[PDB]
Structure formats: structure tokens, C-alpha cells
Amino acid sequence: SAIKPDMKINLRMEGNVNGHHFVIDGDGTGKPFEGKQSMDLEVKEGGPLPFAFDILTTAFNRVFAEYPDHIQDYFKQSFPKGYSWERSLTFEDGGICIARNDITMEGDTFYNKVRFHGVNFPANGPVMQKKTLKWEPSTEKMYVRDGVLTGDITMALLLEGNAHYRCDSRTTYKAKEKGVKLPGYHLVDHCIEILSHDKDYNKVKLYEHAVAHSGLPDN
Amino acid sequence: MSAIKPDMKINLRMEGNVNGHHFVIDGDGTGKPFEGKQSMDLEVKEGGPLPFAFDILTTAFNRVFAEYPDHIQDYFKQSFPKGYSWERSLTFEDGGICIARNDITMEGDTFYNKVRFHGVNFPANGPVMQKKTLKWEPSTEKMYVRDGVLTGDITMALLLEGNAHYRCDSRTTYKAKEKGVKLPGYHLVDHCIEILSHDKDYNKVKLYEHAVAHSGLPDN
Amino acid sequence: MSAIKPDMKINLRMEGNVNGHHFVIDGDGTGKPFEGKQSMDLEVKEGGPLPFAFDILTTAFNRVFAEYPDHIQDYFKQSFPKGYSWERSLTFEDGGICIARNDITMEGDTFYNKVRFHGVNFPANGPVMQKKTLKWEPSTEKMYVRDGVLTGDITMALLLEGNAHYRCDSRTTYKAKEKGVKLPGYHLVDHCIEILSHDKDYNKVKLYEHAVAHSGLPDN
Amino acid sequence: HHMSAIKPDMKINLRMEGNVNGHHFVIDGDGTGKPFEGKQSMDLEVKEGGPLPFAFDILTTAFNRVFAEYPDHIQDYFKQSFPKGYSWERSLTFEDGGICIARNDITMEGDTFYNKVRFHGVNFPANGPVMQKKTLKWEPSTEKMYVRDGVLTGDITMALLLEGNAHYRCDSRTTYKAKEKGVKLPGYHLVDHCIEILSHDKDYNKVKLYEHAVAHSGLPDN
Numbered sequence A: 001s002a003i004k005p006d007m008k009i010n011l012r013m014e015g016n017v018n019g020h021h022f023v024i025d026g027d028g029t030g031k032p033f034e035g036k037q038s039m040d041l042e043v044k045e046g047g048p049l050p051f052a053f054d055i056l057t058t059a060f061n062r063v064f065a066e067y068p069d070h071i072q073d074y075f076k077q078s079f080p081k082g083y084s085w086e087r088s089l090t091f092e093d094g095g096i097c098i099a100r101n102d103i104t105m106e107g108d109t110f111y112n113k114v115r116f117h118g119v120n121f122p123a124n125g126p127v128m129q130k131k132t133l134k135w136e137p138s139t140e141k142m143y144v145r146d147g148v149l150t151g152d153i154t155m156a157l158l159l160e161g162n163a164h165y166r167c168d169s170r171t172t173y174k175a176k177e178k179g180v181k182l183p184g185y186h187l188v189d190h191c192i193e194i195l196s197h198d199k200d201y202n203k204v205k206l207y208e209h210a211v212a213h214s215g216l217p218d219n
Numbered sequence B, C: 001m002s003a004i005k006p007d008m009k010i011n012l013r014m015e016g017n018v019n020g021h022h023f024v025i026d027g028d029g030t031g032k033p034f035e036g037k038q039s040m041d042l043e044v045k046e047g048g049p050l051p052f053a054f055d056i057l058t059t060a061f062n063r064v065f066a067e068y069p070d071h072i073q074d075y076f077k078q079s080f081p082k083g084y085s086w087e088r089s090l091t092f093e094d095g096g097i098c099i100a101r102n103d104i105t106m107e108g109d110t111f112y113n114k115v116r117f118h119g120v121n122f123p124a125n126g127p128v129m130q131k132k133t134l135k136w137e138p139s140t141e142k143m144y145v146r147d148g149v150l151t152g153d154i155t156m157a158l159l160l161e162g163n164a165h166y167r168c169d170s171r172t173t174y175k176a177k178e179k180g181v182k183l184p185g186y187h188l189v190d191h192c193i194e195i196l197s198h199d200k201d202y203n204k205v206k207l208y209e210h211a212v213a214h215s216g217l218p219d220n
Numbered sequence D: 001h002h003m004s005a006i007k008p009d010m011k012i013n014l015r016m017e018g019n020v021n022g023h024h025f026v027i028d029g030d031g032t033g034k035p036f037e038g039k040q041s042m043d044l045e046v047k048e049g050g051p052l053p054f055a056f057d058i059l060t061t062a063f064n065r066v067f068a069e070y071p072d073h074i075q076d077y078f079k080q081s082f083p084k085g086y087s088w089e090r091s092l093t094f095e096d097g098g099i100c101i102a103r104n105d106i107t108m109e110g111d112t113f114y115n116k117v118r119f120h121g122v123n124f125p126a127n128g129p130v131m132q133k134k135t136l137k138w139e140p141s142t143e144k145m146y147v148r149d150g151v152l153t154g155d156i157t158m159a160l161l162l163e164g165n166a167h168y169r170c171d172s173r174t175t176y177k178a179k180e181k182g183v184k185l186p187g188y189h190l191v192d193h194c195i196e197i198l199s200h201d202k203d204y205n206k207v208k209l210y211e212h213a214v215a216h217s218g219l220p221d222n
């Protein structure tokens, strides 16, 4: 009842990768029921960012995800009060990130409080060298663990030069209100895209498409 | 003289050791390469009854059985008639680790599979030695090139009795026998594996699996 | 030239968040860098009482307090006057993951510590959220250079109630503030960290640590 | 609690079968050791699959924790498992995806320990240190011993020194199990080791291997 077909979103991410502090302001629109959202982002300090913007992109709301009827939608059922997610990103070269987002809503807008942190990215690695092109599309596996909805994902960044950079992520989602029903095992296909940006990535426009499904042969 | 025919046969021998238990499993079955479907009947010839869950073996009993669409290169069907081999490592969240290998070849309408499977470090209280597993959930394997070889990464979950999952992380490497097989670009493979039937000790099992490659969203 | 005195003060502020719970922890201590020893009294200024095992934070409260033999380069004694930073990941066997960083500087007789600590994904019924930890066991860190930076790898174990162990994989990267301080070759550190005393809610903690460097067998 | 019959100068017989990246091999070895001094060594000869297309170094830890100096205050699980013996299973995970599985069955007849080892390795990259044979030595390290899921378990983060002097990381988990009943389980401890190829021929077809291990309690107890 609370979510509408078209909603706004405000976002304030703050973080540190490799000792580098940054703030990023975001403002955007999207269709929760179509699994879509875009948003305009602007680094407000920390720019020029010394690292690849790509590592940030998954960390700027699953509520924007096309859920089919045979699958419980934890995220759209979390609102008004909202929900929180925490995430770790484990890169194949030792680079490790942790993140959190408190997602809230009032009126037509979703509010996202997001903290990002990253450690141990190697000097001549693709992240500090900015050799990343984009996230390749993948599929997140959703399941319950310790009484909590958990998502594991097998993720890859395309690099300059016809090779890929592995990332492995675990997310833990918690609805704020008591009583929200945990879903069964499902899978969530997603694509993420930087549609436009300036040369140093101080201002970027980002797009996310997400759809949930029960996998083969039901997808 | 096309190598891949619409209805083909599968001949399999697996020999292995998990936690120091030796075993031999012979397989016979069939499948439809272009539809990405296969089924086979397995018979434990040595080492029955198996002390561990049969489920840990079932990915190791052929990606030639995957429905590839036009716009994605099919390494597997292009690997024939000479064939290919794969190597896989399976890392479970409780420390059990398996490695396996299959050299697969082809004569006429039949694929031959010479498979080896080794496991160690499964705890006695774990869902594997307790034979507490139910099925592999559906999952998506990521295909991409690493050091000039086709590589596949997958995070799979084994559903357990009692409404719980058991995580396995798997990496496989596929190498065509013949020189000059064109490697595919990055893509996804969806799959499902289902034990369709089994006798009480799992000495005789009917297995079925379906694989479909694709390019992820938006495209389907 | 190092300007490390044989008795030094230690001043520290830690700020952070584990599983959404934000805490601030102030420390005051002293140490003897040349025999590898330091102890500090902590008190949590924000976030008391902490909902999680205090022992996970304990690693994060300076390898100058390590005993280095003459035959091994002491990167940490040599990073001063200017100081140094370290970054560190802590991956626990049940999916809990922490990152931490410290910027260490020296003003006279006192080392100053800016520490941030963030922890994610601890399961509600794991040893951390239920406070079933007893101590870190004594272990050994592997120091070596990777990509131009002193790196320390170690697998640690936190003793649990009943004498079970909880396993933590840690990686730290240490960076001298000033350019062209020299790189040690492969060596080992031994460490022990012991919580000496604490009140009921671990809001006042008194922590001791001992660390010595060596080159391993047969030298030792 | 029980006379080991381990006599302070003992022999070692060993047969190994393996496969790494699809290459089959058999290595034999005869050796000697001093179990109470935690020192041992062996002459190995590659009997099949020679010359090996991979770094010999990956195999060297698979060729017995009986040869480890245990001080009185730490339970020695290995010498107490004799005369009957014991077995281990081990997984080796390298930072670039190389994964290995190894197991050994140790028995004792009279003066001689007998080892049946299996070793299998998978997914070593073509231009990695292993396949390109660019390893030099294992650095000294320290394994942590503790009971896990009821079984004596050894964890260790090792590193192979490589040509060009970078290191190549490997993470090992070993499980040890006595053949007979009644063997006491140690408390947590540490075991230092150092392994060294003493001498070898061009193709690593004949190799001389030595190791030294001593168990201890960490700090500041050592």
C-alpha cells in the first residue's frame, strides 16, 4: 500500500577506501514494481576519487526488484518502516570491503543512509589503477541463515584488456518491523550500469535492473 | 558429418575416494545436447553402501548438454569429435573439500566419461556424513576466460532436511582436446540437477540435469 | 634516530560499528617497544554495554611493540619519527567480517592511535553475538611483501566455552608515512594477547600483548 | 600410558600415487628419522610420470607428525597412536586457485614406518608458479593444532618463495585420526616446521627431502 509505481530516492554515502575519505550525494527516480531505478550521484568531497567508482556501485535498495507472485517480497513488505542491509565484498586480490545501508521511507521518497569501507587494495591492482570497465551481469542467491535473509553472489568486473576481476559478496537483510515473513530460496538476476559521468567520476548517473525468479526450470 | 547429434548416449565410469572410502560408480544414460538435457542411471559397483550423501557426487557425473543460443559461443559442442576434459574443486562451508576430473570423448552417438572424484575433511557430524542433504538448489554458473582457459565459477546451495542450506563454492576449468577451439565470451549458465529416483542405500540412482546458457539481463 | 624510547606511553581513540551497533573506545597505556610489550586500560565511552564479544576488537588496539632480532629488518621501529598506518581484514569462519585501520603517530613519549573498526554479518547465535569467546590463542603472523607493501597473514583461533575454537583469517598491510623506508624480508612474529581484567559489561578492559619476531626453524 | 615401540632411530618406507592437472605419477621413498628430535629425511625417486611438468615443491609436505619434538606438557597425539598407527587427510588451497587433496596412511612394522600417500591437484593456471616451475622453497611456518568437530585438526598459512622474490600463498587444513581406541586429544598448540629440498637432479626425478618440527605452546611460554 505504501510504495507507489514511481518513487524518488535520496542518498548519502560516506566512506573510506584505502584511507581515502569521501562523501557522495545521490538523488533519483525509479519503478519498484518494474525492478528499475536510476540516480544521479555527485562526490561532494574526496574527489577526484583515487579508486575505481565501480566498486561503489552495488552499494547505492532491492525494493527496486521485480518479484513474481510465487515469491515472497521481503523488501516491499518492509515499508513504511524500512529495512537494513549489511554487506562484505571479497575481491580475489585481497581487497575487502564492508558496507551498510539503513533504508527508510516517507511520502514518495526512499532515504538511504550508507556507509562504505574498503581495505587492502593492492597498489598496481585494477581498483587503484582504475582499470575496471563494468560489472558483468550475475545472479544473487537468496536464502535464510541464522534466522536472517542472506544473499550470496558470484560477481565479476570486466577489466581493460579482456580479463575479469572476481568479487564475492554476502549480504544480510533485516526488516525493521517485527513480524515480516522470510522468503524461501530464490534467485535474483541483476544488471548495473553507469550511464554517464565526467572524466574523473565526480558526477555519475547509475542504473539498476533487478528481477527475482525460482531458477531453472521455473524462470 | 556433424559431431553433435540430436539424441546421444552417455557412458560413464567414476572411481573415487571420499574421507578414505573407496568407491566405483558406473553410469549409463542419454541426452539431448541442443536442448541441454540429460539423464543417466548409476550403479555403485564397489564401496556400497556409500557412507556419505550421494548428492556431493552428482555434478561430477558434461556441458555439451546445455542449450546455447546463437549469440554465445558453444565451446563444448565445438570440442567434438575429439573431446575435452574438465577439472573442478568443490569447497564446502564446513571444510569438506573435493576435487574431480572427467576426460570425455565420443564414438558414434556415445560420450565416454572417465571420472575421478576425491574428497577429504568432511566432519562426522556434518550434513554430508550424516546424509542430511535433500537437493541442489537451482544455480547459475559464471563462464569466463582465465589464463587462456575456459573457467566456471559457481556458488551453490544444498538444501538440507530441517529447512537449512549448506554452501558449496565450485570452480571448474574446461580444456578442449583439439587445438584451435574458439573460446566464448563471458556468459551465464543456469542449471538444475535432480535425483529422480534412488534405492534405499543409493546403490542405484537415476539422475537428471538441465543447463541453459544466457547473457543475463536485460537479455533472456 | 628512531627516537623510540625504551618506555613509551600509548594514547588511543577507537571509533566504529559492529552489526549496526556504533561504539567509541578510549585507551590509555604504556609499553616497552624493545621487549615487545604493551598494556592499556580501555573504557567504552559510547555504546556501552557492547552487544558482542569484546575479544574481536582486541587485535586492533602497533607492531613497534615487537621484539626484533638484529638479523631481521624492523620496519616499524624504522617508520618513526613520521609514523605509519595499517589496514586489516578479519574474516571469521561463520561469515562475520571486520575491517580496521590505525594511523599511528608519535608526539614525544607517546604513540597516538586513530582506529576505526567496522564489522558486518555476525550471525545472531554465533560465538561473537552470544559472547562465548574466552581468549585469542597464541599464534604466529607471516610477514612478507606483496606488491611493494609489508603484508602480514595469519590464521588465528579464539578459544570458546568448552574448549572449542573459532577460526579467524587476518591480513594486515602496514605502510610507512615517509617514503623509502626499507622492506624486511620474509619473517615471523609470535604474539599473545591477553585480557587481564574487565568489569562485568566489558566497559572497562585492561589488555596486554606480547610480540616477538623470528625467522622460524631451525634458527628457533 | 602405552609403550610406543618407536625406537629413536627409525626407517621410513613410502609409496605415493598422484595426479596434478591430469598428469599421473608414482614416487617412492626410503628414509630415516629421529622421532624424538623431530628430524627426518628421505631419498625420493619418481617412478612413473617423470619428468614432472609441475613444481616438485607442492608435494613435499605430503611425504608424518610423528617426527616432531613434543615437550612433556603437550599431549603427543602421534607417538601415542603407535604401534597401530594413524592417518591424515589434507587440503591445500593456493591463492590462484590451485587446489590439492592429500591423504596418508601410516603404519609401523618393527623399525620401519610405512606410508601410503595419495595426492591430487586441480586448476593450476598454465602460467602460474606451479606449472611454470618457478618455486624455490617453502618458507618456515607454524601449524595450529586443535580439536575440531571431535578430530585433531591442523591449520596453517604457508608461502612458497618464488623466483623474482615474491611469495605464493597456500592455506592448509589437515585432519589426523588414530587407528586404535583410547588416544588422548591434545589441547591447542603450535608446531613449527621447516622443509628443505637438500639435493636434486635436473628433472626432480630423484630428490632428497628433509624436515624438522617442534611443538610448543606459543607465548610467552617458549
Ligand SMILES: O=S([O-])[O-]
Binding pocket: A191
Ligand atoms: O552491455 S550490456 O550490459 O548492456
Ligand SMILES: O=S([O-])[O-]
Binding pocket: A217, B192, B193, B194, B208, B209, B210
Ligand atoms: O533438475 S530438475 O529436474 O529439478
Ligand SMILES: O=S([O-])[O-]
Binding pocket: C217, C218, D194, D195, D196, D210, D212
Ligand atoms: O637445516 S635446516 O635449516 O633445514
